[PDB]
Design a binder for this molecule. Structure first.
Ligand code: ADP
Ligand code: RGP
Lengths: 15, 267, 15, 17
């Protein structure tokens, strides 16, 4: 979750 | 009164900011497509078309903002977000708009070329002739130029905005008409919001000039550019940019828009 | 608002 | 393309799950 909150939408696109 | 249509060959048309961008800053697809189609059919007929477009800044905001949101931490997407630099926007929006124009005109069998001139380089002497030579050659080649003020690199008391660019350009090119395509359907005796005004067919000084309300631009600059463009040749016409057929009926001799003619005292 | 943030979609963050 | 569209239209929490 911390990852999901300090990450950039683009990052979500990359595994 | 509008009788020059039997002579007009070289035409300069300007599309403002509220004619190219609709909702959200994206392109107004139908409006731009219709205007491009009419310009293409005008070019095919034999007229020489000069285009001075605008609206790159909005496209700018759009794509740049998107990129912002794309590369921004989810939580960080709530904290204050910087405002996109005006110059930075221009550098993206001009490219986007020029590419869209190129694709439409390649679909419409017309070839266009990019021509960016900064307004502070117009005091030079060699440019005064080089611009006239290059535009003459490209018009003889049946190629529609798309002039625009270069905002990516540049440097108020004086407003030398897009209207001034179009006016002084048509002063240089020795054109015939400088059509000002805008959201409104012409001049008005005050704001168009209320119902105590009237559409003005012809612009005579000592009947409407210092008797009407004039308000990065606005009609307080539109009128000041149009008067200077008018005196020195080149009658100008202001017409609504929404209507797709407006150019045709303007050039067919019909009575559409407002005239700023140097010999308007006769009419 | 963070609660709302979590609910919204990147699409919505825009507009 | 479809994955991009799915990610563009999803809830943060959904992105988590
Ligand atoms: N007679 C008038 N007096 C004052 N304001 C006017 C008058 N007629 C129109 N306006 C307003 O001024 C604005 C001028 O827009 P315009 O300068 O043509 O395009 P842009 O500002 O988007 O480049 C219009 O949106 C219109 O609402
Ligand atoms: N590049 C844009 C062109 C748009 C524009 O100039 O319209 P105007 O300020 O004359 O109403 C700008 O300089 O603001």
């Amino acid at each position: 979750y911390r990852q999901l909150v300090n990450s950039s939408f683009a990052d979500l696109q990359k595994p």
